[PDB]
Design a protein around this ligand. Structure first.
Ligand SMILES: [Mg+2]
Ligand SMILES: [Mg+2]
Lengths: 77, 77
DNA sequence: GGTCCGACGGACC
DNA sequence: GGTCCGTCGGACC
């Protein structure tokens, strides 16, 4: 019903917004860097929480023909 | 003796040099983008060949505190 | 000394 | 009409 850590989900949604503000695609690596830089969470954990949040439906995973990216439901474009 | 496709290894080593020339860390995502942009190889294949080349010893994988990167043995530093 | 972060103009579809 | 590529100064350790 909600597997992801709710606060970690919040940190990731913050990272997505920041990475987009930096005019970059919000891919796995760039989200990990942003969450690390803002909150000190380790990359391995951010990747698990990104996966879990996608299953919860609180973060959208978009399949691009190149690199996949992730979106806030509140700003799905 | 060699599990990777030798030509794909060569394309990945060119990508590592190009990514470093752009003053970025040669991580998985950035190597995939560079190989895709230069030779049209799909992300899934670049990742497998990167893993195989690391096994062959023709590409070095470096453990970083944050995001791991990849190096040409010819410029290891 | 050496690596690559971060901002941003503008190419791309 | 919108996304993010690609450059590069300079912050970081
Ligand atoms: Mg100096
Ligand atoms: Mg326009």
């Amino acid at each position: 019903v909600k597997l992801a850590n709710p606060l970690y989900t919040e940190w990731i949604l913050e990272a997505i917004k920041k990475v987009k503000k930096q005019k970059q695609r919000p891919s796995e690596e760039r989200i990990c860097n942003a969450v690390s830089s803002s909150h000190g969470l380790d990359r391995k954990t951010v990747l698990e929480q990104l996966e879990l949040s996608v299953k919860d439906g609180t973060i959208l995973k978009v399949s691009n023909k190149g690199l996949n990216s992730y979106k806030d439901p509140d700003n799905p474009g």
